[PDB]
Write a protein that holds these residues in place. Structure first.
Motif, short mmCIF file in Angstrom:
data_model
loop_
_atom_site.label_atom_id
_atom_site.label_comp_id
_atom_site.label_asym_id
_atom_site.label_seq_id
_atom_site.Cartn_x
_atom_site.Cartn_y
_atom_site.Cartn_z
N UNK A 141 1.02 -1.65 0.13
CA UNK A 141 0.13 -0.29 -0.15
C UNK A 141 0.94 1.09 0.05
N UNK A 142 0.01 2.06 -0.25
CA UNK A 142 0.36 3.46 -0.35
C UNK A 142 1.62 4.09 1.65
N UNK A 143 2.59 4.48 2.03
CA UNK A 143 3.27 5.09 2.76
C UNK A 143 2.10 5.03 3.66
N UNK A 144 2.52 4.80 5.78
CA UNK A 144 1.33 4.34 5.87
C UNK A 144 2.72 4.98 7.82
N UNK A 145 2.69 6.41 8.30
CA UNK A 145 3.33 6.51 9.14
C UNK A 145 2.79 6.08 11.00
N UNK A 205 10.72 13.29 -8.09
CA UNK A 205 11.37 12.31 -8.45
C UNK A 205 11.38 10.78 -7.56
N UNK A 206 11.41 10.08 -8.17
CA UNK A 206 10.86 8.77 -8.12
C UNK A 206 11.90 7.77 -6.86
N UNK A 262 3.36 7.67 -12.10
CA UNK A 262 3.96 7.15 -11.35
C UNK A 262 3.91 7.79 -9.63
N UNK A 263 3.90 6.57 -8.55
CA UNK A 263 4.72 6.81 -7.46
C UNK A 263 6.03 6.02 -7.01
N UNK A 264 6.79 6.97 -6.34
CA UNK A 264 7.92 6.91 -6.04
C UNK A 264 7.72 4.28 -4.89
N UNK A 265 6.25 5.31 -3.97
CA UNK A 265 6.41 4.32 -2.99
C UNK A 265 6.01 2.43 -4.27
#
Ligand SMILES: CC(C)(Cc1ccc2ccccc2c1)NC[C@@H](O)COc1cccc(Cl)c1C#N
Ligand SMILES: CC(C)(Cc1ccc2ccccc2c1)NC[C@@H](O)COc1cccc(Cl)c1C#N
Lengths: 793, 792
Positions: A33-37, B117-118, B403-406
């Protein structure tokens, strides 16, 4: 940034970072998933206390007209969450406008400066957190005045360009612990360190200092609040298995509490606790019920500061009044277990509920926050009074107090020197470090309740030279709970006189084995590395107390055997004088005329000289005495035996007198020639027995003395053989039979003494020989004369 | 910095390479306005690596199968090896994501001019990369380093996006330990650089050394700022060791002063462990210096495969470069003019030889290429992703344009692809690679004379410990031209015969050879103690073994034994002659004169005496030692008693009964005491270590004294009875010969007692016999000889 924050906007903004939540919930992102803090799920009371202290200090600077007038100081406090990432995000939040200005391609936003320029940051507690924050901030040259981060790693200012702090460095704390150990003359102390960036550098510095100050470390155990109960019990066991009664603890109260509980369960009331500042000001360990378990603890604590109306300000916490700090609202709910769980009304009384941060007797970290805030405010005031010709920058350049930038505050904070509200002088150096005076306190009971009372037992003054920084009044300090006696802390006792310290492999030099000195080696002074060997003239007692004397040994006039020998000698001399007088009186009596008068007189003379030679081997030996004791016997008894022999030669059938003279002359020439060849002397032979020394005599040549004794024996044999042939024949009042009988006595004595000369060698050699030479003499002069007396009287 | 390498495209890649090698030599006193200062010493290889990155990007663009119609943009910043500069660049990379994430900051109303930036390539500085990942890990932006290799960077409590294309230093140190262990050396001296590269490597090498019993003589730190005194001290401690194998873990600039100093002092022939930093550096490896430091073995990265890279390097031009400002600087410093004399910028670098142009291997450039292609492959993995099928929660993945870096990080952490050469490359969740280190040794080429790096082996991490290292030792040329493995133990193995003893002051691997004591044998080479022989044998001079101690006692065959046998046979012959003369004559006057039975008894006792002399011969036995003394006693007492009863009747059948009574009393005493305490034989070893004697010991010394004294007393009585009667002639003047024979016996007794005392040795059992026989040889002669002389 973080959803929870304490924000109020004025004209000047100060960075805010304190841990308000006690612990962050550890979490690993699945990356699907997308970043989680990660988020904190606990709460810290002391962090909220420090935040309130900062807010009150800012408000009090605002209210004070003398310091920073016509200005409003705003704050932006973000919870540390005990996380590097949270602090980095908060720091980014602080640097928004100057970062945008200083970064290319970001000026295109055409920002209208929506964030006031933060001048400096208070915090943070985490040492590595502080390191990262300083790394990011030094890019913008924005000062960071930390309050709780202390580490020698923070002293490396090639990565930091704006770092300052208001907490004593761990180097000073470890060195002060080493000084406490050294002052009380201890070398065997245990060490316990926290498994973090606070305890590990401290114990490393402590070990490095102990290397210099000859201090030994029995054990180096690391404990925390996550250590297993088995680990804690193992630490307790190795503490019990340790001789040291002094334990230097460099850790936090939460990290120490399981160990304290385990020791309380096991009742070890003999260990002396050296307390670090972290757990010397904690109510989680100060339990009066536990006092007898851990009484006598010595610790460093920060002196109480002057914060007027701090408790009243704490009593003014209210979610309604406090709108610029949301954190208080959370502290409300946990007090009443309601969530607006029932709904909170916002008017519930709080003065009747006690929490740890409300109760205090002295202020240690809140004082640090207060001092850091006032240092920043005083730099701001120095900017406030800046003039075109005043300031620390060239050309006399200053900046508007309403548009103050951090790159000017940095220079002001580096060269700051002022006075506190109590009167304490505060200064900074090129390192930008503030080190205070640690107060050394011990634990005492109260005669009214029994509560633990922190009595100031000493002070550590960092402004003094090393070696005098520590002052301790040993009179006040309790030991072993309440006893008044300095506990013994050494690996081994001091070896007393007669015992040396022997280096033992596999142990440090402080732990030595006491070894008894060998007899003949003395240890007069206590605690001697070796045993000094006594000079050969004397010898050492078992106490090894300054070896005094020894034992000389030789025949003396006064001793039982000496008395018997003296009596026997005087009796022999008396009989000799009796014979001499009888000879003197009678001149032409028939029996004297029967034998040769001159020859009989010579025989009497030789017997006298023989008795004298018997006496010649007496008293303490001398070079000439040992040189002549054997020749005297030789010559005298050979003269006597030769006189008897020439009696027998004429009996069997003036030649006889000349024959005696020739024989004694040949012997005397041999004796003098060999005497000049190799004179006998006296030797003080120590190597016979260590305790007792014998002063004996040694000849020039053993075989040559054998020559003389054999000469005497041979002449005696010739005389006895001639008399044995003539034994039956009576001539001259049957002299021949008595000659045979006397020669038998002499030969028997000569056989008899040598087994006694050898067996009972000892000291009595000089004894036995005499009791031989006299007795044999006592034979001859008796026999060859006794008969002639018996008829003539 | 004011200079940037930027090209714009749909996807932007982060670039951090050190264009300059030095740092600004001045730090301000902050009395003026504080501002960042510029590094002042250029680095050509950093620009080369940047160009390699650009070439890899262009190769991806040209390839129609990987990211088609998608331009890859880059933003590359000069590092200066500076922490803050890289921090500023990282800030630049994270502008939009941070601003959107920042609260009360979105009011800037940015149009997101430059997309986020990725991923970031770099940097070289390990400590720099630490904080870089610390900041990037906040937003989970992947960072693929290329020259930062340190175990300290392997932490994952702070590095949450960190990946690298250079193998960890743990593998390098372990491989060095494996080289030391494989070639069976224990004494090696270690030199490490005073930086973040040499120090962790030497620490890990020391840690691995303890497990594998490797011993380290000296651990010295060198750097480019060390004075000549420090380097000379290092040279001395190198010379003051027996180790020819030197473990060097340092950078080229740090090692170069030491190399020059050693070349100056001419230490010819040594073994150097070469780190990847100085595996093939031209600042160290030179054909002129080969003989000084020949025989070097080192670790290097595998050779890369990047076609057209040299052509792209030859294509650099300040007027043809519009996306790389630093190239202009590259054109200036080389030509010492500015675009001092001025230049138009119309020169050419192809015909001018510079370190930038010259290269023989590709190690860092290959790492950059691999990192860039790894990012490109993660992007292609995003490209192939579907909204209902993917490696994400519910298959959620955004479009390639968004596009996303994660999303890139997840694909990179699970990458497993093949290179242009076909090599399998995969990553882990630790940010580590599993690359292989090749092993190179220096050889001369008789065609030119240049140094040729021959791949002599490899350290492969796809195998367990003890088998990772593979070396073809046949190829390696040692110090100089030697084909023989140099000796590098602390001391030579103690030869079988001498033991190895521990000494404190040096590591336990170093031992002291001590010659084994006599009586203890060393049957094995290198034994911590000497094995003691059993008391049946004793160790030889070489102490190799113990096979024979010594056996000692009187034997029939030996010079003294031959003489004793001859004397005994002569005595027995005389005894038999007397016996035969007695047998023949029966009523001759002289035999009738003495008592016939008594004379026969005397002859019998003399025979038994000569036999008792023989009875103390050969190797002793329990019964033999039990009786050798009683035999003499009984026999010679019988003889002496017979002579005594002759004399008693001479002086004036009682005499025969008196002899019988005397010998009976002695024999009863003998048997009673014999049952009380029997003599036995003892093999006394404690007389001399080499030689053991088997002697006899009696039940009671004083009791044997009793018997010898009994014999002597009876002899004295006989001599006395014949002494005064010497004059009187009776029975052919027997008394005179009786006195003469008793004199012979007494003389022999007083004669052998000092002989028994002084020459104790072995010959005791000898001397006693030569006594007991000779005394016998006396009596049987005298008391008989006269009677023979007249009667024959
Ligand atoms: C010879 C004499 C015993 C003197 C002496 C005295 C009285 C006598 C009475 C009657 C008849 C002879 C007599 C002889 N003095 C000898 C001693 O000092 C010295 O001898 C030694 C000295 C050194 C070592 C040894 Cl191993 C010996 C012996 N053995
Ligand atoms: C008594 C004898 C010497 C036998 C013997 C032989 C021949 C003879 C000829 C003529 C007249 C007497 C004779 C006696 N055997 C003694 C020896 O074994 C054993 O003695 C010792 C045994 C142990 C230790 C000592 Cl320190 C001694 C002595 N001293």
């Amino acid at each position: 940034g973080p959803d929870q924050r304490a924000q109020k906007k004025g004209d000047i903004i100060l960075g805010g970072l304190f841990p308000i939540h006690f612990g962050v919930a550890a979490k690993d992102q699945d990356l699907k998933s997308r970043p989680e803090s990660v988020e904190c799920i606990r709460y810290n009371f002391r962090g909220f206390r420090w935040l309130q202290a900062m807010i009150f200090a800012i408000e009090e600077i605002n209210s004070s007209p003398a310091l920073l007038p016509n200005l409003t100081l705003g704050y932006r406090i973000f919870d540390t969450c005990n996380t590097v990432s949270k602090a980095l995000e908060a720091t980014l939040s602080f640097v928004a406008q100057n970062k945008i200005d200083s970064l290319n391609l970001d000026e295109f936003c055409n920002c209208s400066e929506h964030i006031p320029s933060t001048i400096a940051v208070v915090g943070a507690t985490g040492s590595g957190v502080s390191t990262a924050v300083a790394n990011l901030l030094g890019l913008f040259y924005i000062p960071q005045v930390s309050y709780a981060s202390s580490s020698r790693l923070l002293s490396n200012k090639n990565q930091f360009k704006s770092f300052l702090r208001t907490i004593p460095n761990d180097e000073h704390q470890a060195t002060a612990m080493a000084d406490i150990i050294e002052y009380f003359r201890w070398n065997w102390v245990g060490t316990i360190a926290a498994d973090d960036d606070y305890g590990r550098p401290g114990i490393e510095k402590f070990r490095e200092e102990a290397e210099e100050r000859d201090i030994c470390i029995d054990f180096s155990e690391l404990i925390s609040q996550y250590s297993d109960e088995e680990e804690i019990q193992h630490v307790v066991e190795v503490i019990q298995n340790s001789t040291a009664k002094v334990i230097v603890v460099f850790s936090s109260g939460p990290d120490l509490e399981p160990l304290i509980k385990e020791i309380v369960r096991r009742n070890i009331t003999g260990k002396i606790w050296l307390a670090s500042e972290a757990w010397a000001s904690s109510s989680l360990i100060a339990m009066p019920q536990y006092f007898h378990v851990v009484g006598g603890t010595i610790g460093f604590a920060l002196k109480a500061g002057q914060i007027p109306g701090f408790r009243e300000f704490l009593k003014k916490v209210h979610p309604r009044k406090s709108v610029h700090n949301g954190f208080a609202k959370e502290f409300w709910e946990e007090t009443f277990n309601c969530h607006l769980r029932p709904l909170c009304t916002g008017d519930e009384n709080i003065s009747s509920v006690e929490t740890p941060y409300i109760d205090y007797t002295h202020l240690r970290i809140s004082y640090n926050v207060y001092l850091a805030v006032y240092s920043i405010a005083h730099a701001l005031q120095d900017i406030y009074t800046c003039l075109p010709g005043r300031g620390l920058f060239t050309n006399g350049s200053c900046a508007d107090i309403k548009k103050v930038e951090a790159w000017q505050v940095l220079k002001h904070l580096r060269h700051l020197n002022f006075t506190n509200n109590m009167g304490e002088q505060v200064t900074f150096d090129e390192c930008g470090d503030l080190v205070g005076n640690y107060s050394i306190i011990n634990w005492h009971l109260s005669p009214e309740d029994g509560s633990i009372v922190f009595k100031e037992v000493g002070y550590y003054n960092v402004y003094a030279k090393k070696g005098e920084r520590l002052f301790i009044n040993e009179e006040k300090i309790l030991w072993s709970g309440f006893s008044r006696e300095v506990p013994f802390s050494n690996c081994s006792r001091d070896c007393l006189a007669g015992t040396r310290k022997g280096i033992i492999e596999g142990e440090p030099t402080c732990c030595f084995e006491c070894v008894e000195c060998p007899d003949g080696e003395y240890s007069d002074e206590t605690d001697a590395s070796a045993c000094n060997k006594c000079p050969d003239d004397f010898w050492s007692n078992e106490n090894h107390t300054s070896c005094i004397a020894k034992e000389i040994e030789f025949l003396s006039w006064t001793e039982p055997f000496g008395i018997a020998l003296t009596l026997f000698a005087v009796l022999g001399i008396f009989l000799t004088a009796f014979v001499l007088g009888v000879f003197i009186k009678f001149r032409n009596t028939p029996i004297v005329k029967a034998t040769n008068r001159e020859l009989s007189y010579l025989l009497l003379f030789s017997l006298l000289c023989c008795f004298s030679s018997s006496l010649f081997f007496i008293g303490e030996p001398q070079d000439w005495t040992c040189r002549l004791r054997q020749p005297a016997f030789g010559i005298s008894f050979v003269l006597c035996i030769s006189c008897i022999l020439v009696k027998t030669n004429r009996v069997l059938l003036n030649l006889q007198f000349l024959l005696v003279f020739l024989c004694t002359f040949m012997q005397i020439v041999i004796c003098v020639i060999w005497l000049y060849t190799a004179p006998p002397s006296s030797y003080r032979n120590q190597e016979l027995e260590d305790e007792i020394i014998f002063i004996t005599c040694h000849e020039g040549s053993l075989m040559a003395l054998g020559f003389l004794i054999g000469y005497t024996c041979l002449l005696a044999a010739i005389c006895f053989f001639f008399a044995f042939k003539s034994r039956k024949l009576p001539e001259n009042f049957n002299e021949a039979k008595f000659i045979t009988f006397s020669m038998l006595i002499f030969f028997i004595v000569w056989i008899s003494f040598i087994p006694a000369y050898a067996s009972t060698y000892g000291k009595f050699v000089s004894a036995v020989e005499v009791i031989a030479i006299l007795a044999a003499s006592f034979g001859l002069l008796a026999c060859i004369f006794f008969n002639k007396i018996y008829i003539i009287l």
